[PDB]
Design a protein around this ligand. Sequence first.
Ligand code: FAD
Ligand code: MTE
Ligand code: MTE
Ligand code: QUE
Ligand code: QUE
Ligand code: MOS
Ligand code: MOS
Ligand code: FES
Ligand code: FES
Lengths: 745, 756, 194, 164
Amino acid sequence: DTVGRPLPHLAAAMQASGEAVYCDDIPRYENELFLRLVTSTRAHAKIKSIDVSEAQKVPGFVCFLSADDIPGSNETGLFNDETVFAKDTVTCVGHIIGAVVADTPEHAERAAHVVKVTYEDLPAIITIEDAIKNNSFYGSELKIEKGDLKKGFSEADNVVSGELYIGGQDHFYLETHCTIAIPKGEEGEMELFVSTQNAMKTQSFVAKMLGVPVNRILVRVKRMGGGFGGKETRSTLVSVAVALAAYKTGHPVRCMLDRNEDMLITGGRHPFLARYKVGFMKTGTIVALEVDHYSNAGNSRDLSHSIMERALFHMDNCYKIPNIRGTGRLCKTNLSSNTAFRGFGGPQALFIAENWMSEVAVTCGLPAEEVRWKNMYKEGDLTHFNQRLEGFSVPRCWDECLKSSQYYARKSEVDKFNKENCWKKRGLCIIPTKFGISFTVPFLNQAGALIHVYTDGSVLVSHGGTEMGQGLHTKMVQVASKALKIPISKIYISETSTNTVPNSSPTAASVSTDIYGQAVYEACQTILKRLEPFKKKNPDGSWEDWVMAAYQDRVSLSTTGFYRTPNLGYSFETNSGNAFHYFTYGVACSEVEIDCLTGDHKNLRTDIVMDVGSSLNPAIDIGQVEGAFVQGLGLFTLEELHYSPEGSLHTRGPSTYKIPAFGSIPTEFRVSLLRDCPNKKAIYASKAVGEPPLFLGASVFFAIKDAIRAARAQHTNNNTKELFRLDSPATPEKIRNACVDKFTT
Amino acid sequence: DTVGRPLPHLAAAMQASGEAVYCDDIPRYENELFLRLVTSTRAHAKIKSIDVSEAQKVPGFVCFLSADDIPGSNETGLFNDETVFAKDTVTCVGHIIGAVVADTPEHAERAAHVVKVTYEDLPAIITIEDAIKNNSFYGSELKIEKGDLKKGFSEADNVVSGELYIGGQDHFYLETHCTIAIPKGEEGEMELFVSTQNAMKTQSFVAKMLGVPVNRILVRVKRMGGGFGGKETRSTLVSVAVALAAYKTGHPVRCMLDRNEDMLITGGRHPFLARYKVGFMKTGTIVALEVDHYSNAGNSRDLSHSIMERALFHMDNCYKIPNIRGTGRLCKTNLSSNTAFRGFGGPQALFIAENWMSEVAVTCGLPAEEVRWKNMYKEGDLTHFNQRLEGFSVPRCWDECLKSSQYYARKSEVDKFNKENCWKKRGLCIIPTKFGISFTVPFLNQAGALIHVYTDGSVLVSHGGTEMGQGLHTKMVQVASKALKIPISKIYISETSTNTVPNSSPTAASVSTDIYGQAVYEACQTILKRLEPFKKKNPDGSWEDWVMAAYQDRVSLSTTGFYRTPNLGYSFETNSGNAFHYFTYGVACSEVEIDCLTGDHKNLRTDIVMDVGSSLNPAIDIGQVEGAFVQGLGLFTLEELHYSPEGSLHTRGPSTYKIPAFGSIPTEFRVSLLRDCPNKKAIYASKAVGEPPLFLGASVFFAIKDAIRAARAQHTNNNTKELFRLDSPATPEKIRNACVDKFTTLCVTGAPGNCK
Amino acid sequence: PKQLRFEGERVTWIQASTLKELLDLKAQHPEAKLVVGNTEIGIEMKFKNQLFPMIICPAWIPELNAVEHGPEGISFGAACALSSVEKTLLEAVAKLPTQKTEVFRGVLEQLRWFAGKQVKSVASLGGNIITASPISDLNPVFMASGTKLTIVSRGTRRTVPMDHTFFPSYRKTLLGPEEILLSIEIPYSREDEF
Amino acid sequence: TADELVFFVNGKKVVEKNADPETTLLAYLRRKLGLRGTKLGCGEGGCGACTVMLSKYDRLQDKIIHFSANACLAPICTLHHVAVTTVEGIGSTKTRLHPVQERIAKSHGSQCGFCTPGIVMSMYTLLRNQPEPTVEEIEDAFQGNLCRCTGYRPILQGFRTFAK
Ligand SMILES: Cc1cc2nc3c(=O)[nH]c(=O)nc-3n(C[C@H](O)[C@H](O)[C@H](O)COP(=O)(O)OP(=O)(O)OC[C@H]3O[C@@H](n4cnc5c(N)ncnc54)[C@H](O)[C@@H]3O)c2cc1C
Ligand SMILES: Nc1nc2c(c(=O)[nH]1)N[C@H]1C(S)=C(S)[C@@H](COP(=O)(O)O)O[C@H]1N2
Ligand SMILES: Nc1nc2c(c(=O)[nH]1)N[C@H]1C(S)=C(S)[C@@H](COP(=O)(O)O)O[C@H]1N2
Ligand SMILES: O=c1c(O)c(-c2ccc(O)c(O)c2)oc2cc(O)cc(O)c12
Ligand SMILES: O=c1c(O)c(-c2ccc(O)c(O)c2)oc2cc(O)cc(O)c12
Ligand code: MOS
Ligand code: MOS
Ligand code: FES
Ligand code: FES
């Protein structure tokens, strides 16, 4: 029984030796061809002509594919509002118009570049500001409201109002999007090898495209080199085009995107704009809050509606607000459709909440920790969406982080550094988070597994979840080993496939361990019950002897397992019903030093205390906390996507888009997991960990703001209670310009 | 509802277009290598050296593999008495010594030819008589005995004893053995595409040889171009070698055997030798029977024991015999190990039975139909192994076949032909069969299925059975469609694989329809039960509507089904308990003309009536009767394997081994399935059909024997009750030699001789 | 060590073994691109879809690889990898008075968080200079210091301190069509010079 | 007309009789030689997924030098008489892991695993030049290597074991 032990990721040794196989590492068939997407260079335009003359002169050119080649249907995407191949009009730079197929990827690259498209430009809508001005939205306003707003504000000592923007983020999974499609030649059957978190939609979108039943399409996923939400639906853009080429040619076909194509085409986190108004007492006690959210959804719905719902569920962070109104709108723009990115709308909404909370504290001239603490939910409290907080552990996390980070002592020393230094300043902030666990769409909270014991007693486990680095398969092996009471060496997970576990939800919402853990567990229980008589007959025997006896007595050693998360069903009409199963909680305290003269900064130290219940694997769970935190630090402090005015992405590679490096991480980086906090609601008292830590990254942003505040108090108009706008990400540009001095002027 | 409808084989259009993919049709990986087995040229010898120096010079040569290369275990075979690769000693001419790996199959072939082996010969045992003389057997004697033999032999008016031999048979599946093995390079993982009836054993034997857990090995089978039992275990001789080459090289590797390799290495039907004694009344009524069977098992056990058990279970054919003793011994010999072949020992023992029955009728000077009928079991009788014959339909099959074949009028015409012709004669025979349905090893009578309904309402069925042409998948879709009450166009079966249904029994014993039918049906009931609330909420909605509502309500649309045949377990110690679930029955009448001067013969007409309960698909079942009958016609008349005195197979291709051809089949060939005989014991009242009709091809053998008897009354002597031995197959040589006349005797030269 | 010729679908590459071959080749093919590290040219061909049908690789030539310590400064062959320049300069800095290494120290500051080891082990000095990106981190240091450039063609030879005139316009430098950059002398700093 | 290109990969002689000047070493390793440990993560020299060690006799310095390079930007035509080492050249789970591979694996420094071979080759190169490096030399070796999964802390901590 290894549950609770820091067992390393099962594949890590093979990952270190270069033996682990990712999609493009699969050998090529002798007749395998290569696909490359031909993409829009205009944000909004009619397609006038497509000329392939030059492409046809490229050695090894096979064909050009376009909407006219599709046998089944050109309508695709989650809400059936996308094309597989654009027909008359393109609606973003990156919009897929067609594909070349060639005998080598180099020849496909060369041929694609020489495909000539003629456009007639149409007027484009790129910014959130543009979309609002044109009422260019998907669907209607989303809203959560509680209490009496025109009572709260009537009562408030003060108000703060303003506007905040947070930029998007590219996923930058180290392995880009990849599909191999193998046409069988019989009955429209096709087998697909795909770097995707959603083998179900892949399968369904390929079949729809082809005009073929879903039972003809087999999708297999060994592992991804990262997904982070980005391979949850947008992987089909490559998969469907590759399936089409396989169908047309009758040959195997593959495509792996180059980084620049991937950044342009496949979408990122949603940029958010927020307009807010908070009313509060002289004490810093919040009495009213009104926030209007706007997301830049891009050129299709995709997951944008659910991402806004999640934002609205997290606009409270860990704070009790008696009177509250949040609204969301989804901006329809001529940009690549934006999608799931780790946090799924939560970090954006949580950041908006911490931004005004920080401005409340400044306005009242109180310590930031004091204002946060005094507004914090208490055990038993209801959220603005009327769900009770049971086992609310932020108070413990807060107390322990304050103590172990030595926050009050170091706050003193920050102040001393600031009084002793002119052109460098230190900041220090401590921030909480809560993150609700479940898909907010009730029907996705289902999970299947399938387990076989073979006659040598070795066990093959299959579940609907996929491995992208998060150690899900490791965790499922620890679960099965514990449940079957056999060592992990007897159990194997090979891959995720639609022919072993059908209709699976995407591997998403941080719930995979919870839901597949339960499926695996139930299947193991079924096995144990079937084996029990044989155990009784041969009590001093071995697992192997029991299995073989069951086999020879014609007892089935194969079973399914299923879990359906109970009691979920939030209603926007009644503002009731649980939206989440439980919440994951955490607190981070971060210190930075800024260079007032350059806008550069150094992350000095970070301490995190995270409630992950009783961890299934502390090493994986700490690894998840550190990974998420650093992705969040990149979102808020480093990573910036930049577009031309005509809506074309400039930042298309690691030289223009900076994700955190070895040297970006805090010099002192401490993560602890909260002790003695079992979670009754999930497998073996554990809690979801994948997404909840990312927002803690914001602690570095508010530490930066705190340091800018000190720099301004030194060189500009001195009002202690002076507020200024700092959007996310806080890049060197923004940090420097905000340090107003004799040089900026 | 297509059950009972003549639906074509679902892959038939694709087979006719050349679009259906068999194993070697799968595209090759860019780096894929080819293997060629290196095999013994001696029946029994010590291996003194293998020299690969000339093979190493062949362009594209990669490596030679032998026993030293194996990482896990060199011990293989069903009873663990084989090697993967022979080490110090070879024990038959096709015995696998090693393998060559090369970059093309032409280069593998070239290099294998030039691998030189040095041997020191050892005393070999090839024939059954060799093995009996030397006491060379596997295991001890098998036996079933009932009644009182001494008492029976005393009450007999007449006793006939004799000896009889039935030659073996090569499967001659049009697609030879073939495996592709794909090494993944992580964790010992391997994926194999194999022409095999037994994915479970393939997976186990590969795992065993590699020394890795079974969960690392995935075996997939889309379809076989024929199996006929020869792919039930012997497929692993090629699979395990290819897996080793894949393991060793880290490349994908394949091997498809040339016909000559396949016939030499992979084994065939067991030749049987029988020594018999029957006691009967002047009426033709049987009172005592004693048969000792001996099979030529070759150089390992394989399925030989079970094949002999099935032979003993069928030594009665359709006849009530109060005092009976049958024994069986397996001969251990320096030939390729013999294996399952359609019928699985049943045809050999049923042939032996019809042979002594044919002699009873001749001794009594009574018409053969009358002697058979008189001796036939009745409804509710027990067999020699004390199983009750419930729903015994041979009486019905017999009557309808006599009537529809116009047997009695045709009997007159054959007599008139024989009266008018000197050097040609006609013969006519009618013969029944019964064939027990179940594996005689109780634990193999288990089956799984796995069914998924996707959100578009399309259904994917997986079961433990493999398609080899018998239309198992076709039948499983017809079953699933009737069970789910949806059109067949909504259901699909892709292939058989060990990661969807584990621990599957081999596709064998004719029981696949029966057992996978039930597993599929049970999975379908499970799905129906889960959809029932949605159907109740929306009784006028569609299948698609109910499926989507169930998905949206988080009800699982995926399940297993399993079936375990009830009430099975025969004991040789008590001669008691059911060996079979039920029996399939049939009757065939066949007419032949022989050329007494050359031994050539013509099949004039055959009529068959078969009890297949309520057919799931009369077109497929009629196809099976016709196909199985023609294989039996081959076994008993055409097909003859022939070895050198040193034990080397001479007959290794269609030029020297003759399976039935278009021109071989009876000129008038009529098959009827018996009407209104539902079988309560199996899926939708159907019965197994695979193997039961093959013995009916013996009707041709016994028509030939009848014709020979006429030739002998004409030219050899005047003894109307003479019993001559005629072994199977009755080839031209055997037929001509049996029509003793002025040429066989040389009396025509002026010499004295043994004719009239 | 002899001249190698490689021929592909669109491009001919010549690996020059001697300085004479290089200068001869550059005279015959004035437009030829000189590849060393390929960290610029490989990018222009992949991402700006540029085609350069004639490439000469001079990385083998001893004169383009020579590190020479003189009275006035340290001279590096144009093909010297940035990691070699770094290591030579780190060695000079640790050995010489602080007052002689002000420029070396500046070059070393620009080299610090300049890509990673992989790029710096193959990127040439001459490559960064002749590429003449507006955002080259080395050209401003070389210009400010008046780093001396030895430029060579078949027959002719010259040494010019780098000044503002060396970069006349976008991605252009003041070398004639037949000319190559041969070596780069980075000067010691003087008394009262910072 | 056209010369042979001769190099070595993981101790083995590679003789290219028809080298195309456009071919990168990454393409050659992956798609001609079938050595798929070395990964494509960007193609523009910024992520180090494609990191390999190159080795050659330096005529000038006299010795054999070892250094890291991005195979995605290395033209094969620059490699005449150079020796390439990839991740598969240093250890395997089938034979024996190199200590660099063991320690990154056991230290939880590999999550999705796609950056792991690149980082392995960066550390390995460092050790071929400096068998007893400092902590600072260790962080420095990885300025060219990106990881999206781990937040980097475990990788440095497992490799610190090699310092002093
Ligand atoms: C990821 C990465 C990060 C980078 N970061 C920085 C950075 O921070 N700061 C910075 O300044 N640069 C940076 N660069 C650019 C790098 O410094 C230059 O790319 C490098 O010095 C070019 O050298 P090369 O040998 O690779 O040039 P090549 O690509 O081989 O050639 C470049 C150009 O120089 C010419 N050339 C080379 N030698 C001669 C010669 N001797 N005579 C005449 N012309 C010659 C060639 O014809 C060609 O036009 C970066 C590059 C990469 C890929
Ligand atoms: N190494 C790694 N960790 C990861 C991701 C990833 O792609 N790679 N995806 C994240 C996202 S977006 C989610 S929703 C969770 C999904 O996995 P889980 O449900 O198994 O935790 O893992 C997170 N952690
Ligand atoms: N076309 C075809 N029919 C065939 C065979 C075959 O290989 N091809 N094998 C036979 C044998 S040996 C058996 S045991 C049965 C097995 O199939 P079933 O169990 O589905 O009848 O099919 C019989 N009919
Ligand atoms: O990842 C997610 C996702 O895909 C969907 C979704 C919604 C509607 C659909 O029709 C669909 O296919 C998916 O909802 C979510 C809701 C969450 O709270 C969190 C998530 O991470 C997801
Ligand atoms: O095909 C058959 C077969 O495989 C076996 C068998 C026996 C022992 C084993 O260990 C094993 O794996 C298989 O028995 C049989 C018994 C029958 O009456 C009929 C058959 O057709 C088979
Ligand atoms: O829910 Mo993670 O895939 S954003
Ligand atoms: O039982 Mo059929 O495979 S001989
Ligand atoms: S692939 Fe990113 S540096 Fe080579
Ligand atoms: S482990 Fe995923 S990018 Fe490093």
